[PDB]
Design a protein around this ligand. Structure first.
Ligand SMILES: *[C@@H]1O[C@H](CO)[C@@H](O[C@@H]2O[C@H](CO)[C@@H](O[C@@H]3O[C@H](CO)[C@@H](O)[C@H](O)[C@@H]3O)[C@H](O)[C@H]2NC(C)=O)[C@H](O)[C@H]1NC(C)=O
Ligand SMILES: *[C@@H]1O[C@H](CO)[C@@H](O[C@@H]2O[C@H](CO)[C@@H](O)[C@H](O)[C@H]2NC(C)=O)[C@H](O)[C@H]1NC(C)=O
Ligand SMILES: *[C@@H]1O[C@H](CO)[C@@H](O[C@@H]2O[C@H](CO)[C@@H](O)[C@H](O)[C@H]2NC(C)=O)[C@H](O)[C@H]1NC(C)=O
Ligand SMILES: *[C@@H]1O[C@H](CO)[C@@H](O)[C@H](O)[C@H]1NC(C)=O
Lengths: 394, 438, 65, 54
């Protein structure tokens, strides 16, 4: 289940109590833990199995206490075992452990001195970002234009990895400044205020760079976005199961009864399903592509639905002809769309040449009638040659 | 089928031993009957997961032991015990149940280095699942050195009191009926190798012309010990051999095959070829596999030897041409557990089986034929037994086959080969008296 | 004669078997990392770096597509 | 020529002018006079390569 790290004298837990009690409205068995009130190290593993499903880190400074509770390598080892992480930063409080751990994930937050500044007076007392800058669906999609408060914040430079899922953008006219005479950290629209990250084991992380965002004094602007952001962070909003990835002949027989062959008619069928936290619903989607593949791909065919069930929408590919190239081909569906869950289904099959019997026959072909007629003529003339040769008298 | 009544447990010990890679219990009960119709039976309750993997079930009297009729049936499932000398309805009796299992537990750190101790996790009951009411019941966990509980309860009672190489506790009074109230999990050090095979087929070959019996065994053994982290490195293994003395550790380097008394022609082969690292000393056949079998690794091999037939076969008294064979049901290493055994005995070509007796309750039996060398007619009589769950140390038994083999069918082997040679040479005569000259 | 300061470490493969006289070595391609970083950076992460010394710098990574 | 290796592929695949916008806003200057105006539109007629950064 969930876990809360926090501390007093920087950001108390009382001014977050609207959201955690929302997690109490679900079946999340929360388990708090307090820096500057607890000296025991978190038994995050007893021997080899994982106690907590989730972790939530409220803003703090990471001098010695945070490295006592969770170091970087223990957090890597927690995140590879489907351990969902929600982490927060601010220019008033940059932890060092979380900054290095995010640097391992290709997310580069701004350090202690650097603060983001937006002019043009959006609110002119604190920074605030409208809902135009939400880059990705499947985490939150705004039905109408609204504002999201960000009191003092810090942006992140992002590496170009596949796994990183951007969620919100800096408002394109902002920058960073420090008290020291250092260079600017990020440009206008290249900094990202909140950043998601999805593991290859389908574990998720959300770095969210403001202490004034999730507070109890802000439900008038960022109430639904934080609730569905926390729906996305823990695997509850958008995950995908792929149930039956089966291929067979076009007339219904399987690979087991008759193995495949060059220039053959097959069918392929995979079905997807998503999960809104309560029910496995059928997954409506374009963009799903079959690949028939050697070292290089021989087929990329987009999948039409052609099917339905109570908790699964299937997808077909139509009757397609196998290549005349012999070899060991793999049947691949990598559904890899950022924002929602990665799935891979592959089945490696051998596809052989034609047998010596399974050729166009000599009487079937229009060109070989001459030679069948001439071989039959030589044979019948040979039989009359031996009977005529024996029955004559020399 | 639930038992009604008429047995009440005064004393109830339960001693689990965990020391040789199969769990053995020695329950000791002292029962009292109630004033009713005097009934003569008993029901021992097992869980549905333990009843699937059980290999031996026996009962004694405690005064002086003879045996009792202990029958195992075929969702708590039972096993009946039948008493001779039907008991008066108010009298104390004494009783000993022994049982031997198949499971041993899970390695609780599943990855561990080869120079490190392993610890296993076993799950069981603490309050005894008895079909009847108990008045006093003590538990005793004998076995290896270090025992530790897993998720200890908040109650100070029902907690383990450690003794010298023992772990003694238990709910001691007034347990009403079937009690699945709490499931125990205990971790313990265990330095046996945990050899277990998955499929043993062993083929023996009776032979009246050679007067010899010929054993051939195919072992498919795994090591269910803890797997090793950071992979396998020959440097750490070879330095671990060169440091000292090869104490007791996990992996398999040598196997001690305990054969019958006079065994003559020993061989030990893999699938790919033969293996030369084997040493056949008197009564003992030592074996070194090609690679040391660490935790989770597979190894399938074949051993074989040759005994004379004069000590496994015995001519009957009423007829000269009726033979009775008693075959050792199991030969192997001293610490192994057999998940499947199929014992194929092969009688000669004209033998006809009359009677079959086995001391261990088999799963299956059938009679087929199989053609070996110079089986021109139907072939050898393959009498094959299928046993499921066996222990190397426990299942001491011999299979008794009573068949006949008359001299009318004893001399049909050279007469059949003589029939092929004769019809081949008359075939030569037809192909040399025949005129083809155009 | 070779020395342990030779033979640089192997960060993409790991040995699974090596025979008794060290003839036939059997290696395995260990799977690519879950967080997407290269395996030599995992190797230089898990050892030898860097004496509890740090540096904070503009990472010079270009721009995200 | 010394731009990134990510924008030239995108401007070369889709024909659209890349825009240049100059910013000279400040803090002590009051709003509705801060400069947020796109001032220039470039063009490109180059040849690209494979293995994009896609
Ligand atoms: C040597 O003997 C062992 C022990 O019997 C053989 O291992 C067994 O091999 C079969 C087929 O390789 C395994 O069946 C497999 O089951 C898994 C699911 O458990 C399934 O995914 C596979 O498609 C297949 O059906 C079986 O589990 C396995 N038994 C054990 C205990 O590992 C082995 O094949 C023998 N090797 C040789 C070379 O004869
Ligand atoms: C956070 O840590 C500081 C540092 O120890 C705590 O300050 C101490 O508070 C106790 C009483 O609560 C005093 O007796 C000490 O003299 C204080 N030490 C210093 C250096 O100020 C502070 O109380 C902690 N915060 C909380 C909420 O417990
Ligand atoms: C008991 O043994 C018999 C052997 O006679 C088994 O029957 C054979 O099962 C195989 C399946 O592998 C079939 O191919 C044969 O045709 C069967 N033969 C006969 C004569 O039925 C039987 O399956 C075994 N039963 C159990 C429960 O183990
Ligand atoms: C068809 O798919 C939709 C997907 O939302 C589902 O709600 C509906 O029940 C399905 N109908 C049938 C007949 O399967």
């Amino acid at each position: 289940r969930t876990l809360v790290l926090y501390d007093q004298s920087t950001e108390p837990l009382e001014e977050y109590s609207v959201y955690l009690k929302d997690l109490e409205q679900r079946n999340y068995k929360l388990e708090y833990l307090d820096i500057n009130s607890t000296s025991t190290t978190v038994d995050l593993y007893d021997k080899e199995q994982r106690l907590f499903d989730n972790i939530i880190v409220f803003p703090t400074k990471g001098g010695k206490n945070l490295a006592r509770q969770i170091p970087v390598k223990q957090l890597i080892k927690f995140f590879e075992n489907e351990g969902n992480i929600l982490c927060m930063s601010s220019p008033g409080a940059v932890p060092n452990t979380i900054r290095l751990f995010l640097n391992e994930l290709g997310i580069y937050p701004s350090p202690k001195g650097h603060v983001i500044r937006d002019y043009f007076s959006p609110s002119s007392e604190e920074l605030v970002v409208s809902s135009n800058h939400l880059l990705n669906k499947y985490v939150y999609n705004a039905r109408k234009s609204e504002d999201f408060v960000f009191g003092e914040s810090s942006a992140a430079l992002l590496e170009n990895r596949e796994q990183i899922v951007p969620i919100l953008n800096a408002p394109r006219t902002s920058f960073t400044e420090s008290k020291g005479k250092c260079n600017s950290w990020t440009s206008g629209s290249q900094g990202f205020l909140v950043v998601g990250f999805q593991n290859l084991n389908n574990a998720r992380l959300v770095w969210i760079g403001s202490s004034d965002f999730l507070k109890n004094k802000n439900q008038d602007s960022n109430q639904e976005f934080a609730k569905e952001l926390l729906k996305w962070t823990f695997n509850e909003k958008s995950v995908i199961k792929s149930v039956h990835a089966v291929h067979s002949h076009a007339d219904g027989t399987s690979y087991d009864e008759e193995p495949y062959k060059i220039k053959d008619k097959v069918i392929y069928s995979v079905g997807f399903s998503e999960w809104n936290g309560e029910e496995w619903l059928p997954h409506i989607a374009d963009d799903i592509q079959f690949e028939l593949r050697q070292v290089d791909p021989y087929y990329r065919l987009t999948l039409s639905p052609s099917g339905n069930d109570s908790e699964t929408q299937y997808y077909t590919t139509g009757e397609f002809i196998l290549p005349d190239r012999h070899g060991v081909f793999t049947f691949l569906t990598d559904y890899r769309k950022i924002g929602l869950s990665f799935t891979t289904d592959k089945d490696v099959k051998a596809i052989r040449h034609l047998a010596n019997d399974e050729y166009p026959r000599s009487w079937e072909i229009s060109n070989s009638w001459v030679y069948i007629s001439a071989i039959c003529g030589v044979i019948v003339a040979w039989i009359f040659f031996v009977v005529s040769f024996v029955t004559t008298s020399s | 089928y639930e038992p009604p009544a008429t047995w009440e447990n005064v004393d109830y010990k339960r001693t689990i031993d965990v020391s040789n890679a199969y769990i053995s219990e020695t329950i000791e009960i002292t029962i009292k009957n109630i004033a009713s119709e005097p009934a003569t039976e008993y029901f021992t309750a097992f869980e549905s997961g333990i009843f699937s993997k059980v290999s031996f079930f026996s009962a004694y009297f405690t005064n002086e032991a003879t045996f009792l009729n202990s029958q195992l049936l075929a969702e708590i499932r039972y096993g009946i015990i039948q008493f001779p000398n039907a008991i008066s309805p108010q009298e104390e009796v004494s009783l000993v149940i022994k049982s031997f299992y198949n499971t041993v537990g899970i390695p609780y750190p599943e990855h561990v280095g080869m120079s490190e101790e392993q610890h296993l996790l076993w799950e069981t009951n603490r309050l005894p699942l008895s079909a009847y009411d108990t008045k006093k019941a003590s538990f005793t966990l004998i076995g290896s050195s270090s025992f530790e509980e897993y998720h200890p309860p908040n109650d100070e009672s029902l907690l383990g009191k450690a003794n010298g190489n023992s772990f003694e506790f238990g709910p001691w009074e007034d347990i009403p009926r079937f009690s699945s109230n709490e499931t125990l999990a205990i971790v313990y050090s265990h330095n046996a190798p945990l050899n277990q095979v998955v499929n043993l087929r062993r083929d023996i070959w009776l032979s009246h012309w050679a007067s010899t019996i010929q054993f051939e065994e195919y072992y498919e053994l795994t090591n269910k010990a803890a797997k090793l982290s950071k992979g396998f490195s020959r440097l750490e293994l070879m330095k671990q051999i060169q440091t000292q003395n090869m104490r007791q550790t996990h992996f398999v380097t040598v196997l001690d095959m305990l054969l019958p008394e006079g065994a003559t022609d020993h061989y030990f082969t893999d699938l790919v070829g033969l293996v030369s690292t084997s040493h056949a000393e008197r009564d003992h056949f030592f074996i070194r596999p090609r690679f040391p079998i660490f935790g989770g690794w597979n190894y399938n091999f074949t051993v074989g030897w040759t005994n004379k037939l004069s000590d496994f076969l015995h001519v009957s008294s009423g007829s000269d041409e009726k033979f009775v064979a008693s075959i050792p049901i199991l030969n192997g290493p001293p610490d192994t557990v057999y998940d499947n055994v199929e014992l194929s005995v092969f009688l000669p070509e004209g033998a006809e089986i009359f009677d079959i007796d086995s001391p261990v309750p088999f799963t299956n039996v059938s009679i087929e034929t199989q053609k070996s060398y110079f089986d021109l007619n139907k072939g050898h009589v393959k009498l094959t037994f299928s046993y499921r769950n066996l222990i190397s140390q426990v299942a001491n038994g011999q299979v008794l086959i009573k068949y006949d083999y008359p001299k009318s069918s004893f001399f049909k082997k050279p007469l059949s080969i003589a029939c092929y040679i004769f019809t081949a040479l008359m075939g030569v005569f037809v192909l040399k008296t025949l005129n083809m000259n155009v | 004669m070779i020395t342990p300061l030779d033979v640089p470490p192997l960060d993409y493969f790991d040995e699974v078997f090596t025979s008794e006289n060290w003839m036939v070595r059997i290696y395995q391609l260990k799977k690519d990392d879950a967080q997407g970083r290269t395996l030599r950076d995992v190797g230089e992460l898990t050892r030898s770096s860097t004496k509890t010394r740090r540096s904070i710098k503009r990472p010079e990574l270009g721009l995200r597509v | 020529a010394k731009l990134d290796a990510a924008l030239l592929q995108e401007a070369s695949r889709s024909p659209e002018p890349i825009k240049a916008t100059l910013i000279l806003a400040s803090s002590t200057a009051k709003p509705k006079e801060n400069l947020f105006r796109e001032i220039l539109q470039l063009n490109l007629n180059f040849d690209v390569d494979h293995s994009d950064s896609d």
